[PDB]
Design a protein around this ligand. Structure first.
Ligand SMILES: O=N[O-]
Ligand SMILES: O=N[O-]
Ligand SMILES: O=N[O-]
Ligand code: NA
Length: 152
């Protein structure tokens, strides 16, 4: 569980994301799909994208990036009280979309990467750690719902 100061650092960093949610969303998904090509393969609507240039040109990928980070913002603002988001997201991601927990780790790595690549001057090591802990908390809670379902 995060401290009050850790949550405050998480949500302060998140303010930077909200100044350009679309640009953030696009860069996180590009980082994910290029760094871990298996992840792109799970997304039927984006698997036609073959280069970084095609990815950057897709208005739909940019939209989806906005939708995903907006949903993540919603979760982070609950400061761990996100139980109501767990079954639905685990259910869509485990059951509908067959997304391993490992891929959730990859997008967490991507978020941290893109956050540091844009906000060097805020997202110092301590803020990185707090953000990592917030992302890990959500993933750990999703993992228990994957285990409940027997996902493989
Ligand atoms: O891209 N997460 O749906
Ligand atoms: O779309 N909410 O995860
Ligand atoms: O995208 N992980 O560095
Ligand atoms: Na969902």
């Amino acid at each position: 569980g995060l401290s009050d100061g850790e949550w405050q650092q998480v949500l302060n960093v998140w303010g930077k994301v909200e100044a350009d949610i679309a640009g953030h969303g696009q860069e996180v998904l590009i980082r994910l799909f290029t760094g871990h090509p298996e992840t792109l393969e799970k997304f039927d609507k984006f698997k036609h994208l073959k280069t970084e240039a095609e990815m950057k040109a897709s208005e739909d990928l940019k939209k989806h990036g906005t939708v995903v980070l907006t949903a993540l913002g919603g979760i982070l603002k609950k400061k761990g009280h996100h139980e109501a988001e767990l079954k639905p997201l685990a259910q869509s991601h485990a059951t509908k979309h067959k997304i391993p927990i490992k891929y959730l780790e990859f997008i967490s790595d991507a978020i941290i990467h893109v956050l540091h690549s844009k906000h060097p001057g805020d997202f110092g090591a301590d803020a990185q750690g707090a953000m990592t802990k917030a992302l890990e908390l959500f993933r750990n809670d999703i993992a228990a719902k994957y285990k409940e379902l027997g996902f493989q």
